[PDB]
Write a protein that binds this ligand. Structure first.
Ligand SMILES: OC[C@H]1O[C@@H](c2csc(-c3ccccc3)n2)[C@H](O)[C@@H](O)[C@@H]1O
Ligand SMILES: OC[C@H]1O[C@@H](c2csc(-c3ccccc3)n2)[C@H](O)[C@@H](O)[C@@H]1O
Ligand SMILES: *Cc1c(COP(=O)(O)O)cnc(C)c1O
Ligand SMILES: *Cc1c(COP(=O)(O)O)cnc(C)c1O
Lengths: 810, 810
């Protein structure tokens, strides 16, 4: 049908049909008379997986011959989403499979919709890991994603009476055709025990053994015939475990709990033992595998020439003491040689400055669970503080601040401190975030070792986030400038010579309108809801957080509503305001914000005076596959975090790529997005980092804003008095109370400038041609925000390897 | 190589090789350079499974068209063993696959050895279920095995210092290529709750839901292109289960525990709630499926014309009240019509008379877990006792004895009573066992309803138990009388015209000697043990039980040893005495007997005076796949249960078929084996049922035998004084104490006649020609003991269907 989906050759289509019927019969043991749409999805999945297999085997083979430096991306989260369309896109099979399925009387798009998201992540961080694996394969890096195969990923979100309910994400119920179990490479992981000191050094004994069983998932590069590996570990009890009889077998479930469930906290730390078990489990099994692969090339001087280990935040920080433990206790290297090897192997990406998100593990937990690691951590701390003392003699305060060990009621290990000490590179995830690291929380570490601190601004894969989710936009771009941009997104700048071309302006607006019609219909079908598709689609999709200020958005929506009620017969640009995201299940305030969003919707959507001029929709179960639908349908991207809180964001980039204008604060990658497009092509409002600091010094008094802004007082009096909760007048007293007395994120301080800036968005939306021209200027400058740029920067400036776009032979 | 293994056609072999290489590449994602023997086993498994798939689909299709009466075999146990060789045998692929694997440089026999037993059973009962499924498929019956997919089957037995240690049977670690998950036919099973009475009858409410997910395993018939289905249920939590968040997800394991582990008790009842949950789970999910399939043919008068349900002992007795509950509470049939349908649908096989094996469930357990079933059971009891009262007016004692409800400290339901009341047929499993049922424990039920009581003598499948385990014997038989006997074992009588043929006598002895050489070498390799293969192989393999009297065997072995020490320089027929079996983990006395067997071995095998004249071997981890090796190697079958305790036995039949002579009591199927071969071709000794009864009336005084038999006193003084346990002189005081004061199974009463009969075995073994002639007379009369005869009898006399040997088209 469309050019960027590849060729449907007569041979290819015939062969895809033969193999689809072979899998339906032999693999699924179904005839065509009893097959369900789900059997047809599986037969197709198996048929596309067959095209991966040769490439996967030849790629892993090639890495054995050439023995390049190996990259190990350690993450507790890989937010993969669906695999089928991504595989077809990257193998150029999409049109062939459309054709082959059409000739068997099936709709490929209907079968695509039956795939479960691999939801093994919370949001930005897990999804960055997935975009990275795609970019590492596209750039021919010998890269491995290592993590945990959670039985249950991020919970499925139901709304009941406007409240979030959680349901278990049973994503493996029907089987995962993408993974290959490798039970033959099962490795032991040790817990508890105690340290004995001998003549021959320290010895970790009386440990409980958990087995780590790997599942390999293929990661295809973009048409380069490279297939890298994501290895995920599953926890298994040994067969002698507890071995009255019955209970011993049932108690195997204590050990297997380690890989049962993803912790559903976004940008928050929960100090639970099961979480620390997950962190050690992935580090212990991964490092044995890394070392096994290295020894099949005694001499560990070459280890950092053959191995880069990237730590995705501090979640796998134990990789540092674990590598020391293996090198010192098992390989019998001296401390200093082992440490040199460790520092040159490890690098640490920091993702947040929020105090409540930084991992600070109580010493009593590490003492019980990982006694030897705690000894190695104390020893690291001693030798690290001795270097601080020598460089800053007499600065005892620096020594207390830089310590890996925090003093207090409970002693904690600062895992971030451990990562900086044990890594040759520390990077933030956007320029402003990397600057904030050097000026604030890591100032001391920066003054000791300025050379370690880098920026690597985040990116998104234009494969999933343009070609796959927005084929119509991909196509009209390819019509003008060819296909090369999909693996070289900087080529999108060539679109600037088309901002005054009438046909291109018409095609960009037509794709946007088609995406909106398609998404409005998706809402009708799956959730019986009626939206005007000629309205401005104002979309805020991201995890529910105080710092991301969904509440600021709520205040704008109630402001629009109050303005309609006051002057009902005046023209307003119509809007569908859509807010979606999950709250962490124990995050009371995030759960109240969801409830307020739905409560606003219950009042606004049923007011006859409002008409189809204002709709408020809570998008249920926001996840990777809902993002692929709603991002392409959006007109306005809401990126309205308080300046200095959103380290980068990646949602922002997705919408820039897909033809939405951004209303945002000078926070995270928003700053670099505005720099690339021009400030005049961006709806920037609100405090800078500098202004928030000025407010903090004098004191944030919310009362002042409530007293000076009559429009804001009206909203607060409405919230307080039960305008939005008639049967429960005090339902939202916690929200009012927090906004008035304990707002860390200064929602009221940005209110006036937000509402005024939202009027400028409406004004431009009245002028379709100038809206679409500004959209073109955004799409055209979105190249920097490709994960291909990000990974090429990690590769050249951290890992010491050269990316490549050269194809492996088929 | 050998004729009964089928043709290796040039096309067949080429095609098996192509598909083996296709599965190694596409299915296992291995090249030939990294593949292990286990990858080669899997590629072959997948290649043979592909030949099942067409036949399976066409068979299930054919049953939908023809809509024959359906047989449902409900068992908590299917002792399947390995599937690969069985599939090849029944599809005539064995020589083709040998040839195809040989040409790829692999040894098929080495790959066969890598398959895990499906050990979803304890022994005789579970293995009867497996032999039955094979015979039902061979006789073209529309039959379904229904059970539980236990994650852990019968434990792996290790011996440490002569003691049994249990290890978890992780049989699914590497995957099961034989099963097909059918998550789309998942059914709810209810537990707990309470009964509400309405206008519209009774209603079971506030229940906990467990999901039952079926796994289908193919059951190929012998070269008739029939493939029946074994459906096993797996327990799954619903996604709203417990739905702080983390614990709710981890607590899903409470529901999934139902199908986690097989209870490892043989011929013993443990009244545990988890066991009752397993019993309801398989019955609830199976009956919904049975009814679903019936409704795709309102009118339940025809139900028993379309459905037979066979209960394998009382383990699925809840099928009776469950069928009533569905018919009365859900389908709104009146009680009497529902009961008529239930009785005509259900039939009950009894397997034991041992009091401690009969299921008697406390009322308080049924009250809490299955409140509605208990109400239906009380109602059954009332209407049943009203018929007893009418037929036997004034016999209040009969009423107490026949009650489904036993009075006492705790009230119990007698599940056997429920089965007789709710079934149109009750059968024992050997003629003497069926007679004992009518004269003793079910006398009262027999006098009320004589027409219900049948015999169906057990059998074994000659496919697994001759062709598969003993190809050399199968072949020399096929040389003389053709192949037809494999599906018509009565044809073995034709071998009687060869008892005086010298070539046949030579070939029978050569196969036996080859089997013994092959088994002696298996012992050397896997367990570093050195046996004389010219010795008589005296084999007792079965679960470790007081009633099966391994101890009587021990007494003979110590007698032989004491006779050698007294007269070292006199000739004795050399023997390898091999005893093997598992003890139930909580069965203290069974665990002590294993320890005594190994303790005898430690003394006997290390005495230089004894030489290679007497060896005692404990065969570790006795299971279906060890039975396929040791049964063909045996000279003497030990079937020495106390008369009236072994309902049938099936081991006995396996050895008769495979060229071993039997030393046994007139117990179980031993009686009919002796009748078929002639008493003169059988080593019968000991008390009959009549003699045990005579001893019971006067009182069993073990002292009397100890006082009169000096040889026996010597053994007891040796056991007591620590002759067999030097460092622990009192190790075996429990064994001596039980034999002297509390022996329910009268070991000493059979001792004298056992030792004298064992001398007659030795005498005949000195005369190879007359031993082999007696062996021929045994093999020749073993036809009755085919499970094909058994199932044809169930079919004609219980289920009301005609067996068929006609092929489905390929
Ligand atoms: O770099 C990827 C994204 O990382 C987000 C983040 C920071 S900390 C964090 C986290 C996620 C799960 C469990 C614990 C912490 N996620 C962070 O909040 C986003 O700004 C950023 O875009
Ligand atoms: O009919 C098959 C075999 O059944 C054996 C049996 C009786 S009761 C029983 C059992 C097995 C497992 C759990 C509970 C009871 N097995 C019984 O002990 C054998 O004699 C007989 O051959
Ligand atoms: C990209 C993405 C995110 C991250 O969005 P932010 O706006 O940067 O928080 C979260 N969830 C999903 C499903 C995503 O695709
Ligand atoms: C046949 C068989 C049994 C039953 O043997 P009995 O001697 O009748 O108790 C038990 N276990 C296995 C593995 C069998 O094959």
């Amino acid at each position: 049908q469309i050019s960027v989906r590849g060729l449907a050759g007569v041979e290819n289509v015939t062969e895809l049909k033969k193999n689809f019927n072979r899998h339906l019969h032999f693999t699924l043991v179904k005839d065509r008379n009893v097959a369900t749409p789900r059997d047809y999805y599986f037969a197709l999945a198996h048929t596309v997986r067959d095209h991966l297999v040769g490439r996967w085997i030849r790629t892993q083979q090639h890495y054995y011959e050439k023995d390049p430096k190996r990259i190990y991306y350690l993450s507790l989260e890989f937010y993969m989403g669906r695999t089928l369309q991504n595989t077809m896109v990257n193998l150029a099979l999409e049109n062939a499979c459309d054709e082959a399925t059409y000739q068997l009387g099936l709709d490929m798009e209907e079968l695509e919709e039956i795939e479960e998201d691999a939801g093994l992540g919370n949001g930005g961080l897990g999804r960055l890991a997935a975009c990275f694996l795609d970019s590492m394969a596209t750039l021919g890096l010998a890269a491995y994603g290592y993590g945990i195969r959670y039985e249950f990923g991020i919970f499925n979100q139901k709304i009941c009476g406007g409240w979030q309910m959680e349901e278990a994400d049973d994503w493996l119920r029907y089987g995962n055709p993408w993974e290959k179990a490798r039970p033959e490479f099962t490795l032991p992981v040790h817990f508890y025990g105690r340290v004995e000191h001998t003549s021959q050094g320290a010895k970790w004994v009386d440990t409980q053994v958990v087995l780590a069983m790997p599942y390999d998932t293929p990661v295809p590069g973009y048409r380069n015939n490279v297939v890298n590996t994501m290895r995920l570990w599953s926890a298994k009890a040994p067969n002698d475990f507890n071995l009255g009889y019955i209970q011993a077998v049932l108690d195997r479930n204590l050990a297997e709990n380690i890989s049962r469930v993803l912790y559903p906290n976004d940008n928050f730390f929960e100090g639970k033992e099961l979480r620390l078990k997950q962190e050690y489990f992935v580090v212990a099994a991964t490092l044995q595998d890394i070392i096994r692969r290295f020894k099949s090339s005694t001499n560990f001087d070459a280890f950092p020439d053959k191995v880069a280990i990237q730590l995705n935040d501090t979640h796998p920080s134990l990789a540092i003491p674990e590598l020391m433990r293996v090198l010192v206790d098992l390989e019998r290297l001296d401390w200093d040689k082992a440490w040199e090897v460790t520092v040159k192997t490890c690098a640490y990406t920091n993702h947040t400055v929020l105090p409540e998100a930084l991992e600070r593990w109580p010493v009593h937990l590490l003492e019980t669970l990982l006694p030897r690691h705690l000894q190695i951590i104390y020893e690291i701390n001693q030798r690290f503080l001795n270097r601080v003392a020598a460089a800053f003699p007499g600065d005892v305060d620096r020594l207390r601040r830089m310590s890996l060990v925090e003093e207090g009621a409970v002693k904690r290990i600062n895992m971030a401190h451990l990562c900086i000490a044990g890594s040759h590179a520390v990077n933030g995830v956007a320029r402003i975030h990397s600057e904030i690291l050097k000026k604030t929380i890591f100032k001391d570490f920066y003054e000791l070792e300025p050379h370690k601190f880098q920026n690597k601004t985040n990116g998104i894969t234009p494969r999933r986030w343009l070609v796959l989710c927005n084929p119509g936009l991909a196509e009209i771009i390819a019509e003008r400038i060819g296909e090369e941009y999909i693996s070289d997104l900087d080529q999108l700048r060539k679109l600037l010579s088309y901002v005054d071309d009438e046909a291109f302006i018409r095609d960009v607006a037509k794709v946007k309108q088609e995406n909106k019609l398609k998404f409005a219909a998706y809402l009708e079908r799956e959730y019986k809801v009626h939206i005007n598709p000629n309205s401005l689609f104002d979309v805020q999709v991201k995890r529910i957080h105080e710092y991301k200020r969904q509440l600021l958005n709520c205040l704008h929506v109630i402001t629009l509503y109050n303005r309609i009620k006051k002057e009902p017969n005046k023209f307003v640009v119509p809007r569908t305001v859509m807010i979606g995201g999950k709250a962490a299940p124990g995050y009371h305030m995030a759960k109240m914000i969801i409830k307020l969003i739905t409560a606003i919707g219950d009042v606004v959507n049923h007011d006859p005076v409002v008409g189809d001029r204002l709709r408020v929709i809570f998008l249920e179960n926001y996840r990777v596959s809902l993002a692929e639908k709603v991002i392409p349908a959006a007109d306005l991207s809401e990126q309205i975090s308080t300046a200095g809180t959103e380290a980068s964001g990646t949602g922002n980039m997705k919408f820039m790529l897909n033809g939405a204008l951004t209303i945002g604060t000078m926070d995270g990658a928003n700053v670099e997005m505005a720099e690339e497009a021009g400030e005049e092509n961006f709806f920037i409002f609100g405090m800078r980092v500098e202004d928030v600091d000025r407010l903090d010094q004098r004191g944030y008094n919310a009362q002042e804003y409530y007293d000076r802004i009559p429009e804001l007082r009206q909203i607060i009096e409405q919230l307080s008095s039960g305008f939005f909760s008639p049967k429960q007048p005090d339902l939202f007293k916690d929200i009012v109370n927090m906004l008035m007395h304990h707002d860390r994120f200064k929602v009221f301080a940005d209110y006036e400038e937000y509402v005024k800036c939202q009027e400028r968005v409406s004004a431009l939306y009245k002028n379709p041609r100038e809206w679409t021209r500004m959209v073109i200027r955004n799409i055209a400058t979105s190249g920097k925000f490709s994960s291909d740029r990000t990974i090429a920067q990690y590769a050249r400036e951290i890992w010491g390897v050269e990316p490549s776009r050269q194809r492996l032979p088929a």
